[PDB]
Amino acid sequence: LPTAQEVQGLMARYIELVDVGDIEAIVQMYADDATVEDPFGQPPIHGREQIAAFYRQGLGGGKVRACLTGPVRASHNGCGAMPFRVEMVWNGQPCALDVIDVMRFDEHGRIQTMQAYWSEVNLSVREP
Amino acid sequence: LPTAQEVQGLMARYIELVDVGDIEAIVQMYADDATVEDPFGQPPIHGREQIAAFYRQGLGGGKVRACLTGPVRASHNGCGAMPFRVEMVWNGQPCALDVIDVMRFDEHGRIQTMQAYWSEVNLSV
Ligand SMILES: C[C@]12CCc3c(ccc4cc(O)ccc34)[C@@H]1CCC2=O
Numbered sequence A: 001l002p003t004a005q006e007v008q009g010l011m012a013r014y015i016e017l018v019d020v021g022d023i024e025a026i027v028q029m030y031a032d033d034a035t036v037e038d039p040f041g042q043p044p045i046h047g048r049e050q051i052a053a054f055y056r057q058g059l060g061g062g063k064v065r066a067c068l069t070g071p072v073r074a075s076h077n078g079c080g081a082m083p084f085r086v087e088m089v090w091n092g093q094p095c096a097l098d099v100i101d102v103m104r105f106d107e108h109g110r111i112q113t114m115q116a117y118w119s120e121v122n123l124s125v126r127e128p
Numbered sequence B: 001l002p003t004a005q006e007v008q009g010l011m012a013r014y015i016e017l018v019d020v021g022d023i024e025a026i027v028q029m030y031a032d033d034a035t036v037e038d039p040f041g042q043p044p045i046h047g048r049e050q051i052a053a054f055y056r057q058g059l060g061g062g063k064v065r066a067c068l069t070g071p072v073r074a075s076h077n078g079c080g081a082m083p084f085r086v087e088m089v090w091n092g093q094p095c096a097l098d099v100i101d102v103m104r105f106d107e108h109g110r111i112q113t114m115q116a117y118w119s120e121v122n123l124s125v
């Protein structure tokens, strides 16, 4: 499993990929059998193909940005959690959404599970 | 289960209690049979007695400070995650540790599970 430092690097890279919107690069970070729960509480997304469609829907449209708003917290069992902000335009309204992603990586350094904690209480109208 | 807004309030209150070292109040926020994994990766402890002993050893001194460093993220199923920083002493010198706690609340508004994400990579001098 990736070391604590490696997890910090991997999770930070993920945010960089989301920020630029490189869908294919994001999908490649996931294990072909990964699961995504975003927002946490909803039915999971299973596998590369479904995950690709998920990111294309979320990042393939209007301009979206993402940035860490604090350091990645990493564990010694291939897991980590990170706080970040996502910016987007919702029907003309400039918005910001605060999120925390928790990830578990496998022995190949790929994301096995991702859980995104957030809800409408974390949304707000704000200029980019 | 607590609503998303209620989760935000409960988790913020927890940090306030940690900051002042109110062990008794912290323990009461947990379900009687709750589990704590801190740091996540280590074996979980079970029950209020074990949890109380854990917090007594961690905050017993009285020189530990804690504060949210970002908003509490909350779900619609009684769960939340929050980023915070704790300040204490390491090797006889002021230090800081960045942590993210993930909590699940039960139907009675008590913490059923807490998982604290952090490691040495989050410790600064
Ligand atoms: C889809 C989305 C843009 C990207 C995004 C959202 C929420 C959680 C995320 C978690 C991630 O790890 C990466 C991207 C997002 C937003 C929900 C509303 C929106 O426009």
Ligand SMILES: C[C@]12CCc3c(ccc4cc(O)ccc34)[C@@H]1CCC2=O
Residues within 6 Å of the ligand: B018, B038, B058, B059, B064, B066, B086, B088, B089, B097, B099, B101, B116, B118
């Ligand atoms: C115990 C401790 C102070 C408080 C604290 C730590 C780690 C995770 C925590 C998680 C919490 O939800 C509340 C308090 C802590 C530190 C580990 C080293 C230290 O001095």
